[PDB]
Amino acid sequence: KKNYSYKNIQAIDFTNLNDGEKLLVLEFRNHPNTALWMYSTFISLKTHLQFIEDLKNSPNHRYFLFKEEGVYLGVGSITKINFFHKHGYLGIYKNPFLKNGGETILKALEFIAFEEFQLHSLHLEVMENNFKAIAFYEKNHYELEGRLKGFISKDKEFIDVLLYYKDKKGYNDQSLLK
Amino acid sequence: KKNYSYKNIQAIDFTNLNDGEKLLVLEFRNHPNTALWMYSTFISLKTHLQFIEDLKNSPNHRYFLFKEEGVYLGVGSITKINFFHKHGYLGIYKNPFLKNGGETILKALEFIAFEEFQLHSLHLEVMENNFKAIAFYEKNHYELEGRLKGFISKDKEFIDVLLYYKDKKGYNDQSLLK
Numbered sequence: 001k002k003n004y005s006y007k008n009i010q011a012i013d014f015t016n017l018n019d020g021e022k023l024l025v026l027e028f029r030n031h032p033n034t035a036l037w038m039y040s041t042f043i044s045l046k047t048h049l050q051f052i053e054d055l056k057n058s059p060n061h062r063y064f065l066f067k068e069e070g071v072y073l074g075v076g077s078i079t080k081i082n083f084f085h086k087h088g089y090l091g092i093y094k095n096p097f098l099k100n101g102g103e104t105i106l107k108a109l110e111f112i113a114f115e116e117f118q119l120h121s122l123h124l125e126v127m128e129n130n131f132k133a134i135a136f137y138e139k140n141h142y143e144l145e146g147r148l149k150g151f152i153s154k155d156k157e158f159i160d161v162l163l164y165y166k167d168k169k170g171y172n173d174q175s176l177l178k
Numbered sequence: 179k180k181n182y183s184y185k186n187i188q189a190i191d192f193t194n195l196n197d198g199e200k201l202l203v204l205e206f207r208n209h210p211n212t213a214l215w216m217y218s219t220f221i222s223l224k225t226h227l228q229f230i231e232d233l234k235n236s237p238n239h240r241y242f243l244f245k246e247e248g249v250y251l252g253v254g255s256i257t258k259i260n261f262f263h264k265h266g267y268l269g270i271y272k273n274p275f276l277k278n279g280g281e282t283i284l285k286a287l288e289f290i291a292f293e294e295f296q297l298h299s300l301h302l303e304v305m306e307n308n309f310k311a312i313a314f315y316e317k318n319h320y321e322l323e324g325r326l327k328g329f330i331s332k333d334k335e336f337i338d339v340l341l342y343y344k345d346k347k348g349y350n351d352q353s354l355l356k
């Protein structure tokens with residue numbers, strides 16, 4: 001339950017958020033630009049505060065608020081971590097008031113996952129209609145590995161979740177080639 | 179947190195297990211024939227008892243001990259349930275001292291998932307080297323939808339998890355054709 005540093009980027013564990021930061025995360029999370037692409041649309045403050053409390057005893061779920069030179073970039077998570085099998089799932093939503101930031105969050109987040117946690121593989125669940133996220137991860141060398149068919153209810157139809165992954169060798173190859 | 183009935187089969191929620199049944203489940207679970215195919219190999223009694231306690235406040239995770247005319251058939255679960263999106267994951271291990279039983283557990287379990295819970299889809303994670311389980315689900319009309327690549331550590335190598343699913347229409351088609 002500690003923070004991390006990558007370049008001039010800080011990853012603030014959710015369990016170390018000051019009270020302003022707790023509300024900022026909630027604002028980021030409930031914004032239409034974020035919520036539309038989440039499994040649940042709206043998080044009450046009560047739910048949010050409880051979630052953060054529960055994270056204190058949930059070492060397999062790590063949420064970070066990313067900050068860089070005074071700017072809050074957005075949120076990244078590494079979840080359903082398993083340390084024997086060395087896998088985890090990645091999640092990101094950027095500050096909805098900023099034009100970019102996702103790339104920076106991803107780089108720091110992958111540093112944490114592959115170097116600090118020494119994970120072997122990272123997996124992604126992304127809604128099949130989330131074209132901006134799909135393109136984003138494909139550009140970052142994430143590779144398609146399947147679907148969860150009809151996993152999501154959207155506008156009264158069931159649509160798919162897409163599954164992507166990156167392993168440690170892939171991560172290494174990116175870094176060897178600067 | 180209630181039990182269910184399907185034909186002459188009882189599904190006993192883990193939160194309603196008598197103390198003998200709690201130890202029987204643990205015996206089923208830690209047996210080499212079960213454990214070899216689980217994400218974790220060995221569950222201590224302490225962990226087990228805590229797990230059952232936590233299930234009392236975990237409506238999205240349902241574990242059942244199946245019994246039929248005095249015979250304990252094994253365990254089935256419907257987990258990571260989401261009631262807006264109407265999905266869940268299925269899991270089974272039979273009484274390792276019996277030659278069959280999986281089929282019976284599956285039928286009752288699918289009844290619970292699709293009729294009682296009214297889920298739209300059920301998903302499976304199965305280790306790629308688990309040939310007996312693979313054949314079993316394929317025979318029961320589960321359909322391949324992808325992989326979690328290198329998800330599992332086995333004998334110091336990383337192997338894959340296979341993803342399968344069945345939806346409500348598939349379930350219906352089976353039942354229409356008796």
Ligand SMILES: CC(=O)SCCNC(=O)CCNC(=O)[C@H](O)C(C)(C)COP(=O)(O)OP(=O)(O)OC[C@H]1O[C@@H](n2cnc3c(N)ncnc32)[C@H](O)[C@@H]1OP(=O)(O)O
Pocket residue numbers: 033034037090091092093094099100101102103124125126127130132133136
């Ligand atoms: C596995 C999962 O995490 S699934 C859930 C994914 N999360 C979400 O969908 C939440 C909503 N979306 C986001 O948080 C983000 O858009 C992410 C994390 C998906 C991607 O991060 P982004 O910063 O948006 O990366 P992206 O490549 O799409 O940025 C757009 C680029 O074009 C510009 N741009 C900004 N907005 C847009 C836009 N709507 N359309 C096209 N270009 C845009 C930007 O300037 C940026 O380029 P630059 O940094 O060089 O200046």
Ligand SMILES: CC(=O)SCCNC(=O)CCNC(=O)[C@H](O)C(C)(C)COP(=O)(O)OP(=O)(O)OC[C@H]1O[C@@H](n2cnc3c(N)ncnc32)[C@H](O)[C@@H]1OP(=O)(O)O
Pocket residue numbers: 211212215268269270271272277278279280281302303304305308310311314
């Ligand atoms: C998504 C998930 O749940 S993944 C984890 C799956 N669970 C496990 O791997 C735990 C260990 N294995 C099991 O629990 C079970 O074997 C299951 C649930 C996978 C399948 O249930 P089973 O009862 O074994 O079904 P299966 O079709 O393989 O039964 C074997 C059949 O051939 C006979 N048979 C019994 N043992 C064997 C055996 N080792 N090999 C071949 N045939 C056998 C049986 O008589 C049975 O037929 P019958 O009921 O008509 O008499």
